[PDB]
Every structure is written in C-alpha cells, then in structure tokens.
Write a protein that binds this DNA or RNA. Structure first.
Lengths: 74, 70, 50, 29, 116, 163, 101, 132
RNA sequence: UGCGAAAGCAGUUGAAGACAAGUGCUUGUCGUUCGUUAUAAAUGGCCUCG
C-alpha cells in the first residue's frame, strides 16, 4: 500500500584512560627537570596520624613464602 | 535487640514469668518476647518502616588435608 | 554416568553447561539404543535362514 | 503394538528403581 | 530508604524500593573511616576520621545522588570518634580527647569528671 | 623372594578370547563393490562403503552377484568388529543384503560357520540394550525434572578538588 | 507480620590476624588481674583490644590506615605505669600507641 | 479439565472408589497431569492413594493398550519420588513389589519380541520386492 | 531366612531386663537374657635395600 504522506514528511524533517593517566600525574610526587628531579613534600599530619607505609619487598616476600607451589595451597 | 548472630524483641509492658573458655570472674571487673537465631552473621539490623526490617549479612585457598571417606 | 548423576543432582540444576552435556548425552544414547534396536532385528533375521 | 507396550513397560520399571544475594521474607512474631 | 556502608575510606550507599547502588564515595585520606552519620532527611552525610571530619551534602538527581562537600574548617581540624545528628542541621561530636560539643553546620557541653 | 610371600598374579603374554569364538569349530558402485570383494582391496572397498545414501545401498546390492554377497557379509562383520562406532551405517548394508539375497542364503550348506562373526558381533550389541535402557530411564528422569525446573555513579574526591 | 529484607550486597571483610599478645604474664597461683587484655594484630593496620572477662567482649579498636599492616605486637606492664603497646608495621619503625586516644 | 481435577480432588478426600475412573478420564492431557500433581497433591495421603490405585491397575493388566495410567505413574514418580519413598506404609511397599514383579517380567518379554518385529520386516519387504 | 537358576518364588525383622540423656513420664543404647527359619565419620592409607 502507498505510504502515508505524514510518514514520508516527518522522516525528511528528521534527516576514561586519559582521566586515569591524569590521576597518575597527580599521584606522581617527583618529576625530572633537565638534570634535576624535584620531589613533592608530604604533609606533617599524614605522617603523625598513621604509622609509615610498609615497605613491600620485605612483606611481599613473606606472602609468597606462605603461598609456595610445593606447599600446594591449591 | 540484636547481636552478631541473634535478634530479639522484648516488650517492656509485660513482666517475664518468675518460675569454661572465659575467666571465672572471681575478681572484680575494675580494681511479647521474640527471639531468633536464624539470621547470621549480622552486620546491621534496623527497621526501614513500621513493618519492614533490614537484616544485613556477610555472604583464599586452603592447605589440602583430605578427609578420608569410604 | 549414573553415580555422578545420583551424586550431583542439585549441582546440575545451577550449572547450565552440564545440562547441555546431558542433552547431547541423551541424544547419543538414544542413537546407541537405535543402533542396537536393528541389531536384534537383524540377528533374528539371520536366524530365519538357518 | 506389543513393541511399544513392552518398551513403555521397560521405562516404567527402570524408573521405579531410581544462595540468593537478595531475599524477601516475612518474619513471624 | 538508603543503606550506607563505609569500609577503608570508601562509602557506598544503596537504595531499596529491588536494591540499587545509587552512589559510591571515594576519599583521599589513607586513614580509614571511623564513623559515618547521615542526617534524618538524608541530605547531609558526615564522614568522620580520627585525623579530620568531613561533611558532604547528598542531593538526588536521576535515581542517583549528587555529592557536594560542604566546607567547614572546624570539623576538618576536629578529631571524631563518634558523631550524631540532633536534627537535619545540628550535630554532636565527641573529640578524641573526650570533648563533646554542638555544631550547627563549637558549643561545648560540660562533662562530669571521673575519679581516677 | 621370601618363601612366606605369596606369588603374585601375572597375565604375561597370554591370549584372551571369548566363548563366542567360532573360528576353529545410475550412481551405483556395484562393479567397484564386486571388484574390491574379489580382490580383497581394502582401499577400494572403503571408498564404496563411504556412501551414506540408502537408495544407492539398495541398488548396488540389488545387482550384486549372489555368491559375492556372502563374502561381503563376512567382510562387513570384520570391519564392524574392528570399529564398532561404524555399527550404525554397516547394519544397513547387512540388512539390504539379507533381504535381497535371502533366497540365495537359504540354499547354502552352512551359514553359522561362515557368518559366525556377524552373529557374535550382532549379539554384543544386544547385550548392551538392557543396560542402556536402564541408563536412559535414569537419564530420563533427571533432565525431565530439571527441564521443568560502577564508574557511572562514582564520586572521586581528588578529581573534584582538581575540577 | 513484618517484612524482612535480607540483604547481602554489603560486603565487609576483616583482615587476616597477624599477631597475638596478652597484657600480663601468666601466674597460676595468683588470681586473674582486672586489667588483663588481649591485643589482636591485623593485616590492614587495625589493632583490636579484647577482654577475656564476661565471655569475650571487645573494648577498644585502633583503626589502621591505607597500605599499613601489623606484623608484631608486644606489651609492657611495669608496676605503677600504664599498659604500653608497641607494634611493628613492616618498616624500619617501632610505633608506641596512645591507648587513651 | 478443571471440573475433572476438582472431582478427582473431592473423591480423594472422600475416599471414593471412583478414583480410578477419574484417572481413566480421557480428558486428561500430559501438561495437565503435571499441573495437577505439582499443585493439587500437597498431602502425603493423597499421593499414597493415587499410587496405590494406579499401581494395582497396572499390576493386574500391565499390557493394557491405554497409555494414560502409565503416563500417570511415570509423572507421579519423577515429580514426587522424594515424597513417595517418604511413605512408610507397609502396604505401599508391598504394592511396589507387586508392580515390580509384573513390570520385571515385561522387560524379559521385550528382547525376544524385538527380534520377531525385525523377523517379520524382511518377510514384508521381501514380499514387496517380489510384487515389484 | 527357606527354596531355586544366576532370574526370581514365599516369609521375617518380637518380648523381657539394665544403663544413659531430657523433662513419675519421653527418647536412645546394650563385650544382658528369652523367642522367630530369620549409613559411616578421633584428619586417621602399605618400608627400605641403585
């Protein structure tokens, strides 16, 4: 059947990763300038309120040992 | 009233019928009724409305020690 | 097949992948039934001549 | 006809040998 | 009908009519959240830590909550073990040194001395 | 070896056997079929056996010389015996042979000795049937029963402070 | 009759227990001191102090921090002084805690 | 359908002997049988009565041409096996054994019969070839 | 348990005493007896001499 003229007429009328990288730049506390590298200084409160961050190489070693293959933690 | 593993309700307008692994506590510390244990463990319990109750519940590899079955 | 079936009923319900394995298992055994069915027809047929 | 009667009988004989994240429930008090 | 949970400096809020996580909040401070108090209306959420106290206003837009951090210096420099709402505006905060005071969004409250 | 110890069971190189072992007691490919059977050409006949069209099976065996039919029956038994998964297709060949040359097969001095492999082969499939039906019924009930049975909302304080 | 909305979309997971330490030395002859406490070391930096009296009730929590853990605990109980708690956070540091705050 | 389901429900409560006739009604269809057993058989007693009635009939005549009762038995067990074995009536167990005995024989009937079904097939087909 | 073929055909699984637990009553047990043909579950798996 022939189309309604209204259909034809109305048709004719009608016819994150960057954000993530931005965080890392803000997270970055030291940058190299020529021969220089400048370091940001943290606030005194952050140190006083909480104990210092754990160093990982000392701790990550214990965790892998407890999860050794020969153990077969499975 | 509720604990980590139990929930209870008491009416204060009704009086009740009269009818090992902890310190013995010989020393001093210093110097109408509904009870349910079905829901556990409980993170938080409270009402949403007069007839609506919120119950919030909690929903690593292991060293293999086989349990012999025959 | 029976023992796992008798042993893992409830598991089969929540596992769609295992169900399809049973479905194709249904078809093949049905064929294996179907293949066997002629064999009894044929063997009796062989008996007639002898 | 006797085939399907027998085959039907076989199936009957062998037959006789043989948590949600959110739940809505009404407590009773 | 909001359910709010806070764990490891992350606050998640759910709405139940069936549940939808309307919003989630991520906080800078390494310190974990001690307590969170929500105003009776729900527009004002107070997030408390031993180091600081921060208050955030919650506004519903398109089955989601918009978050704005109302700025008040006194709470930021205030340690908070416990915090509660008198009403949609006034709160009571007990500082880590046992100082109970009222803030309108400090009116200190006298406390009886305890014998040693 | 300790004399108290009991000697263990070892089969070694012994030959296993079964009690049924009665050895010591257009478009047609007929001409190829007669050809390979006479000459025992496994490669040639296997191509003939590759046809899955029933009408071809009937027409080919329809014209096959009746004496050559008997040896064909023997050979199908062997090929079935080595590969049982080909049971289905090859019964069809044994079937159409039997009906067409049945009159000839009647006028044969002995059949069981020359067709023992078929009888043993066909018997094995029958022994399966009672058990499979039991499996099917158990396999029937279970399926019968079981057939019936964040970033969008994220609010980051750092980005908000940044802008 | 009331409607129960059993909710499990909220997940709170504790940290692995890392260290254990009592605040007093065991003395079979003497009675249990009123001040006996048990310190719990957690992998997320939390120190929990519990009381063995009245079954076990938990008195006070020291909240941990991001990227901070507990690997060792020791108590100091000198007569006439307040109980002192020391912890090791997996770094070149010894931390003494103010139990009051 | 609905009327017969209600009638069968009433007779089960009334301990009527007409239960067999209700089960023998030709109006029953396989989807309806599922709906009735799942929805209406909520009491152990009703399940026991139907099983006793149906089993007795099949035991008396295992070779009855009508497939309705076998359909009832097959669906009764698949959907209510847990409830059926839960029944501790000694007579129910005895009725089971009788049903097993008759059906057990029928299984022995089949393998010889299937050969005979084949054995006639070529006689018919061979006759057809001769006609052609 | 009897008979029989392996298939199956028939028939059984009672009573007393004592102990324990729970609350005189209830349940479960027996290195106790009389009579009838008459689930399990203490983390617990097999040596060495090439």
């Amino acid at each position: 059947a022939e189309l309604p003229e209204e259909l034809l007429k109305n048709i004719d009328q009608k016819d994150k990763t960057k954000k993530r990288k931005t965080l890392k730049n803000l997270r970055k506390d030291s940058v190299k300038r020529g021969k220089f590298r400048v370091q940001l200084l943290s606030t005194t409160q952050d140190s006083k309120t909480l104990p210092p961050k754990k160093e990982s190489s000392i701790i990550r070693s214990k965790d892998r040992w407890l999860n050794r293959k020969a153990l077969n933690k499975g | 009233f509720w604990g980590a593993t139990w929930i209870s309700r008491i009416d204060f307008d009704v009086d009740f019928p009269i009818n090992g692994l902890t310190i013995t506590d010989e020393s001093n510390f210093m110097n109408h009724f509904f009870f349910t244990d079905k829901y556990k463990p409980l993170l938080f319990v409270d009402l949403i409305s007069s007839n609506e109750l919120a119950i919030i519940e909690r929903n690593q590899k292991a060293f293999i020690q086989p349990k012999l079955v025959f | 097949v029976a023992v796992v079936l008798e042993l893992y009923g409830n598991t089969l319900e929540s596992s769609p992948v295992l169900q399809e394995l049973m479905i194709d298992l249904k078809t093949k055994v049905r064929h294996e039934i179907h293949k066997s069915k002629e064999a009894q027809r044929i063997e009796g047929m062989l008996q007639l001549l002898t | 006809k006797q085939v399907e009667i027998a085959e039907r009988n076989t199936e009957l004989w062998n037959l006789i040998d043989t948590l949600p994240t959110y739940t809505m429930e009404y407590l009773d008090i | 009908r909001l359910v709010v949970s806070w764990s490891e400096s992350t606050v998640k809020i759910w709405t139940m009519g069936n549940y939808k996580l309307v919003c989630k909040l991520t906080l800078k401070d390494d310190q974990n959240i001690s307590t969170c108090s929500l105003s009776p209306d729900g527009q004002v959420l107070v997030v408390g830590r031993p180091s600081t106290t921060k208050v955030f206003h919650l506004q519903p837009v398109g089955n989601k909550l918009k978050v704005t951090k109302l700025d008040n210096d006194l709470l930021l420099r205030t340690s908070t073990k416990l915090v509660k709402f008198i009403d949609n505006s006034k709160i009571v905060i007990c500082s880590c040194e046992d100082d109970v005071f009222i803030v309108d969004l400090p009116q200190e409250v006298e406390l009886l001395e305890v014998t040693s | 070896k300790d004399l108290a110890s009991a000697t263990n069971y070892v089969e070694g190189n012994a030959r296993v056997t079964s009690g049924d072992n009665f050895k010591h007691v257009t478009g047609t490919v007929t001409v190829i079929l007669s050809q390979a059977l006479q000459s025992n050409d496994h490669s040639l006949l296997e191509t003939v056996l590759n046809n899955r069209d029933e009408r071809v099976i009937r027409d080919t065996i329809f014209r096959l010389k009746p004496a050559l039919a008997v040896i064909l029956l023997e050979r199908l038994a062997e090929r079935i015996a080595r590969q049982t998964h080909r049971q289905g297709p090859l019964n069809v060949w044994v079937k159409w042979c039997l009906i067409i040359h049945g009159g000839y097969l009647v006028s044969i001095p002995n059949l069981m000795s020359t067709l023992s492999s078929l009888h043993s082969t066909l018997k094995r499939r029958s022994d399966l049937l009672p058990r499979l039906l039991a499996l099917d019924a158990r396999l029937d009930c279970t399926i019968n029963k079981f057939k019936t049975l964040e970033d969008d909302v994220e609010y980051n304080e750092e980005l908000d402070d940044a802008g | 009759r009331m409607i129960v909305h059993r909710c499990r979309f909220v997940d709170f997971t504790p940290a692995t227990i890392t260290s254990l330490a009592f605040s007093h030395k065991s003395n079979i002859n003497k009675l249990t001191p009123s001040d006996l406490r048990l310190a719990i070391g957690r992998s997320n930096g939390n120190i929990e102090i519990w009381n063995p009296r009245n079954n076990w009730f938990q008195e006070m929590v020291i909240e941990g921090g991001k990227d901070r853990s507990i690997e060792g605990l020791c108590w100091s109980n000198v007569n006439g002084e307040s109980l002192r708690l020391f912890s090791i956070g997996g770094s070149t540091v010894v931390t003494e805690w103010d139990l009051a705050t | 359908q609905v009327e017969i389901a209600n009638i069968l429900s009433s007779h089960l409560e009334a301990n009527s002997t007409e239960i067999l006739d209700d089960l023998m009604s030709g109006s029953w269809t396989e989807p309806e049988i599922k709906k009735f057993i799942l929805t209406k058989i909520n009491t152990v007693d009703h399940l026991s009565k139907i099983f006793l009635t149906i089993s007795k009939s099949i035991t008396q005549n295992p070779w009855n041409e009508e497939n309705l009762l076998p359909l009832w038995l097959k669906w009764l067990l698949t959907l209510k096996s847990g409830e059926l074995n839960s029944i501790k009536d000694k007579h129910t167990k005895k009725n089971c054994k009788h049903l097993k005995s008759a059906l057990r024989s029928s299984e022995e009937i089949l393998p010889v019969l299937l050969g005979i079904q084949g054995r006639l097939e070529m006689l018919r087909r061979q006759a057809k070839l001769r006609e052609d």
